[PDB]
């Protein structure tokens, strides 16, 4: 059932949240923000999944079913993931503002489009899709250049997290298009199952990869 999948997502996010919180208990003044950011990313996702598991935020409309908490979660957590990537890359305020702006357009577009019946939802998707390409450009270009100015360990971690992010985030728009929000070829169950998997990897997987590099970064 959908509720079982939502609960599994919630449990997965909670386990991640607790792991990141504990892992950062004795973090230094320079690592602190990273652990706290990870806690926020999986923590908010955990709330969203619990809400959906309780059957709240389900929007069965225009003969399809979309989930408001999913998109609200994304709007709030993806910018924190970009913030984490930005911190590693060593961005200044201006640069942060640019990528957060692009990221926000992507997420707001997917949210609005998912709630809009009719072909107009594809225009909203398009807006998000273009903003996304701009975001990927920044992650692979300017931000990678910026990260290259830091330690070898930071550059390596940035690249690892950047690749996971670009590659997997690129999959979400296809699920949006093929799933309930779009042509609805994927059923709600299959749609939710794929997103639970992607979300856990992009947030919890992302986090454990960072945790696994912490010791090496301190040593260098």
């Amino acid at each position: 059932g959908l509720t079982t999948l939502f609960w599994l997502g919630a449990i997965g996010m909670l386990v991640g949240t607790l792991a990141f919180a504990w892992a950062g208990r004795d973090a230094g003044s320079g690592e602190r923000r990273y652990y706290v950011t990870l806690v926020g990313i999986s923590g908010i996702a955990a709330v969203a999944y619990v809400v959906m598991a309780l059957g709240v935020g389900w929007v069965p409309v225009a003969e399809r079913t979309v989930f408001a908490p999913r998109y609200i979660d994304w709007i709030l957590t993806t910018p924190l993931i970009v913030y984490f990537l930005g911190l590693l890359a060593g961005l200044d305020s201006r640069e942060f503002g640019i990528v957060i702006t692009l990221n926000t357009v992507v997420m707001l577009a997917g949210f609005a489009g998912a709630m809009v019946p009719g072909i107009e939802r594809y225009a909203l998707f398009g807006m998000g899709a273009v903003a996304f390409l701009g975001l990927v450009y920044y992650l692979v270009g300017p931000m990678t250049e910026s990260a290259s100015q830091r330690s070898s360990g930071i550059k390596s971690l940035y690249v690892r997290l950047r690749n996971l992010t670009v590659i997997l985030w690129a999959i979400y728009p296809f699920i949006w298009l093929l799933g309930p929000p779009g042509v609805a070829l994927l059923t709600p169950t299959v749609d939710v199952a794929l997103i639970v998997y992607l979300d856990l990897v992009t947030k919890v997987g992302f986090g454990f990869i960072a945790l696994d590099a912490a010791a090496t970064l301190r040593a260098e």
Binding site: I171, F174, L178, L185, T187, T189, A193, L194
Partner: protein, 51 residues
């Protein structure tokens, strides 16, 4: 990736079987195309993670 694919498959099978219990060929077809596309997407996800 292997265990998950089987898990996803079981979930997809569950839908196909539930759809079949109605006797509506159209409902089964919907669940099946969803399962097929989903498994294909699952490969994309698995591959991306590995890379």
């Amino acid at each position: 990736v292997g265990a998950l694919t089987v898990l996803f498959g079981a979930i997809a099978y569950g839908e196909v079987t539930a759809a079949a219990a109605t006797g509506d060929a159209a409902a089964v077809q919907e669940a099946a195309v969803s399962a097929i596309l989903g498994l294909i997407i699952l490969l994309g996800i698995n591959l991306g993670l590995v890379a």
